[PDB]
């Protein structure tokens, strides 16, 4: 069954490099294109290049001096490198295979999740967690003080999915970020069930585990 | 190099209503071979961007018949019959007859629906942070219609300014509501100065602003 | 004689506020309407906003929630205001003067020289600057200026007696997240002995002023 | 809200040749009062927009008569006639007859001359820098043409990779040439480990590949 994933490094220093690995499964990258595709935070997507199954390949005008795609068709992998970074490269970056067609795809069938790359001279953080306290009932996760994005957030393992809220991270003046993940339960559960917040940081690789309490 | 225009940038429409979408292209995207390339996709919010039409108007599978492609050479129409609320995201067009491939800007789908109050509740600062030197209180304003609200913090009934920030959710694709949450940030010193901590609410749905608060 | 010019403070920090000023001279903004116009780094053109002559005023559709534009007649100034920074508004802030027509101008006829706006969270730092030391009957030499923050520095040579021959880079960002750029002049080899060169450095966000003699 | 869409991004263009610039609006810009408000603005580099066209077709003062702009309803076209080394810069259209006005994206004027091979100087890092901790290598390609060139760092005869950034000027107004600096950054320790230092530079107007050196 298809799937891609990339593989990023989350924060990359100005002037310097960046490596992004796309790992794919389900079909052959001997019989198939990939194409990669940005998006800029809170703006429009971006085709970067693609590299053929034979393994020519194209690339974006504006980013092409810096850009280069290879591929190792045994090892069901694709790599996108660029040099000499810009703040305007911070991005999220998908592989998509491509679907249909002869020498031109049709379309873009499957996607990966997309791997978040922030362009900044700042160093890694990871976040402080406190609890928001709480026949409805509002409790949450205060999620302070990281850098760079994203944070991942889930309730009690992921069991817990509805009446859940994460909020956009807002960035502080500190130049750390900010958020808090919220959900609706029953008043009747709060002296019964248990109530953890799972906070995933993989830039820091730092995970927390908080109890929310009454 | 080709540049690909789409309109609207937003388009708010009504459950149940129609949504068209323009694509334009500055030159023709007919191939040589004949075939036109043009494709949609709709990116939801959280999710990855999905394939909707391929070569003007063939619908990938899974894709309902509520959506529809038409056009021909520079001109394109994405068409929505009796939206939903599942179809709200960003609608992207997407040229591939000619090198270097391009997407548009986007067209953003709002969707239209009835009032909806917030559920307004009041979060004081945790113990754990306030033994770190630093008080955020925090306001949540849940599932509401529509997104225009007013957030206003007041200590013992000063209306502050200036030392809080908002945090909106992105439209829900069930019930088409927002969600949004607004953090007061005070040092430790500022907080323990002061005794009534609100939070005050004004909305569409609402017949009076509506207060939450706590004494500390 | 028809000048404006733009007062900033060249850094402020993410979710902070940015207050500019235009002020005006050789004509009435009682008599004109001013546009705010802005640019970020490498990026085109973005109209902001206006304030009409009567007072009223218009805004950008994208920052309308977070922007304020006023006026004084009687000093001659103009003022923008911004609340909630985001990284994209790192920009050069312009005001124009309306031009021509009745009720729509037809165009912005005389412009300020633009004020660069940086958001962020890093502090400010002055450069260090140290000489380039000096073809057929040709010399070059010039000034490297080194680990400043944030933009623009200005550079001159001779106190500005000595215009032809210059060429003062594009900054380049480090991986230090500061900037460095070299300023460089062509010069008669014949002068090196009898001339001197002194390169004037100026950079306003950290109030630091470096005269380097550039010798052989 | 109006989208205006200019083409081509990028326009190189020879020495006296015709330029033609499109720009196209998604809607009418005709008023409901029988005037269509479209200016055209130039930006040189270093400088703030100035205003060629307004209403059209109209030149504003002091605007030579080689630029002309026409069009109607969603159609407009710039034309230069006999392209000068001072026309380069880019061009903006700006509709303001619909509220909000904006501006197109831009088209990048690029002169076509003839070929101009670099004029190359390299300089050592100063002692003062040096006693700091830290070596800065420059390598300087003065006014060339095209903007292409190769330049490749080598310390005693090794080529180097990673430990470099380069600067190019905008394309000169008066020659329509480009300069270039490399800049070779180092700690001391690392400087003082080796002993030529060399920039050899690849240009089309260039024989075969010319080095600059020296001993250190
Ligand atoms: N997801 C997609 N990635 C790409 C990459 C390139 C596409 N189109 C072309 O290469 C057109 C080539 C025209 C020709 O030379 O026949 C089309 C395309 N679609
Ligand atoms: N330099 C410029 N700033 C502006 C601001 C606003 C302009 N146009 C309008 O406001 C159009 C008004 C349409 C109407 O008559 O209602 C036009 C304009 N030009």
């Known amino acids: 069954d298809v799937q891609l994933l990339e593989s990023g490094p989350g924060l990359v220093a100005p002037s310097q490099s960046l490596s992004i690995t796309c790992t794919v499964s389900g079909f052959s990258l001997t019989n198939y294109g990939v194409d990669w595709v940005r998006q800029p935070p809170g703006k429009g997507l971006e085709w970067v290049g693609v590299i053929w199954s034979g393994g020519s390949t194209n690339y974006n005008s504006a980013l092409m001096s810096r850009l280069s795609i290879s591929k190792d068709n045994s090892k069901s992998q694709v790599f996108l490198k660029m040099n000499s970074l810009q703040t305007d490269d911070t991005a999220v970056?998908?592989?998509?295979?491509?679907?249909?067609?002869?020498?031109?795809?049709?379309?873009?069938?499957?996607?990966?999740?997309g791997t978040t790359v922030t362009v900044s001279s700042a160093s890694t953080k990871g976040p402080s967690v406190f609890p928001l306290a709480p026949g409805t009932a509002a409790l949450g996760c205060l999620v302070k003080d990281y850098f760079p994005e994203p944070v991942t957030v889930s309730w009690n393992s992921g069991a817990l999915t509805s009446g859940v809220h994460t909020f956009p991270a807002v960035l502080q003046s500190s130049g750390l970020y900010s958020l808090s993940s919220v959900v609706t339960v029953p008043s009747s559960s709060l002296g019964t069930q248990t109530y953890i917040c799972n906070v995933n940081h993989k830039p820091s690789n730092t995970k927390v585990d908080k109890k929310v309490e009454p | 190099e080709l540049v690909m225009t789409q309109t609207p940038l937003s388009l708010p429409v009504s459950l149940g209503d129609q949504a068209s979408i323009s694509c334009?292209?500055?030159?023709?995207?007919?191939?040589?071979?004949?075939?036109?390339?043009?494709?949609?996709y709709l990116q939801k919010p959280g999710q990855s961007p999905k394939l909707?039409?391929?070569?003007?108007?063939?619908?990938?599978s899974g894709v309902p018949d509520r959506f529809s492609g038409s056009g021909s050479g520079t001109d394109f129409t994405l068409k929505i019959n009796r939206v939903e609320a599942e179809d709200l995201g960003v609608y992207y067009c997407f040229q591939g007859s000619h090198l270097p491939p391009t997407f548009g800007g986007g067209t953003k789908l709002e969707i239209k629906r009835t009032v909806a109050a917030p559920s307004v509740f009041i979060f004081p600062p945790s113990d754990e942070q306030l033994k770190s030197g630093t008080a955020s209180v925090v306001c949540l304003l849940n599932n509401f219609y529509p997104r225009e609200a007013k957030v206003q913090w007041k200590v013992d009934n000063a209306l502050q300014s200036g030392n809080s920030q908002e945090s909106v959710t992105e439209q829900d694709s069930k019930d088409s509501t927002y969600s949004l949450s607004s953090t007061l940030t005070l040092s430790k010193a500022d907080y323990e100065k002061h005794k009534v901590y609100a939070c005050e609410v004004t909305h569409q749905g609402l017949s009076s602003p509506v207060t939450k608060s706590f004494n500390r | 004689d028809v000048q404006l010019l733009e007062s900033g403070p060249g850094l402020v920090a993410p979710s902070q506020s940015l207050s500019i000023t235009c002020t005006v001279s050789g004509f009435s903004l009682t008599n004109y309407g001013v546009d705010w116009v802005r640019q970020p780094p490498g990026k085109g053109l973005e109209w902001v906003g206006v304030i009409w002559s009567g007072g009223s005023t218009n805004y950008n559709s994208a920052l309308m929630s977070r922007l304020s534009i006023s006026k004084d007649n009687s000093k001659s100034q103009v003022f923008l205001k911004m609340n909630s920074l985001q990284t994209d508004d790192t920009a050069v802030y312009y005001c124009?003067?309306?031009?021509?027509?009745?009720?729509?101008?037809?165009?912005?006829?005389?412009w300020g020289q633009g004020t660069t706006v940086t958001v962020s969270s890093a502090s400010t730092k002055g450069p260090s600057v140290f000489p380039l030391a000096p073809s057929g009957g040709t010399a070059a030499l010039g000034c490297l200026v080194k680990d400043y923050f944030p933009e623009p520095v200005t550079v001159s040579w001779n106190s500005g007696a000595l215009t032809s021959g210059v060429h003062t880079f594009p900054a380049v960002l480090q991986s230090s997240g500061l900037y460095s750029l070299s300023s460089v002049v062509t010069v008669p080899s014949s002068s090196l002995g009898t001339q001197t060169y002194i390169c004037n450095v100026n950079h306003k966000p950290s109030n630091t002023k470096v005269d380097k003699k550039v010798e052989p | 809200e109006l989208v205006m869409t200019q083409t081509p991004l990028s326009l190189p263009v020879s020495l006296g040749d015709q330029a033609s610039i499109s720009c196209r609006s998604s809607?009418?810009?005709?008023?409901?009062?029988?005037?269509?408000?479209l200016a055209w603005y130039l930006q040189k580099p270093g400088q703030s927009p100035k205003l060629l066209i307004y209403?059209?077709?109209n030149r504003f003062s002091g605007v030579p008569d080689r630029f002309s702009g026409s069009g109607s309803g969603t159609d407009f076209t710039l034309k230069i006639n006999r392209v000068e080394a001072e026309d380069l810069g880019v061009y903006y259209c700006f509709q303001g007859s619909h509220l909000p006005p904006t501006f197109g994206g831009g088209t990048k004027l690029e002169i076509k001359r003839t070929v101009a091979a670099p004029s190359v100087f390299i300089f050592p890092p100063s002692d003062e820098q040096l006693k700091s901790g830290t070596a800065s290598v420059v390598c300087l390609l003065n006014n060339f043409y095209p903007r292409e060139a190769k330049v490749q760092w080598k310390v005693d005869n090794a080529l180097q990779s990673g430990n470099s950034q380069e600067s190019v000027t905008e394309q000169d107004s008066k020659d329509s040439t480009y300069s270039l600096s490399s800049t070779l950054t180092l700690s001391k320790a690392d400087y003082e480990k080796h002993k030529v230092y060399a920039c050899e530079v690849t240009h089309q107007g260039l024989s075969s590949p010319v080095t600059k050196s020296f001993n250190r």
């Open positions: 124009a003067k309306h031009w021509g027509g009745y009720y729509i101008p037809y165009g912005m006829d005389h």
């Open positions: 809607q009418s810009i005709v008023h409901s009062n029988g005037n269509t408000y």
């Open positions: 209403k059209v077709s």
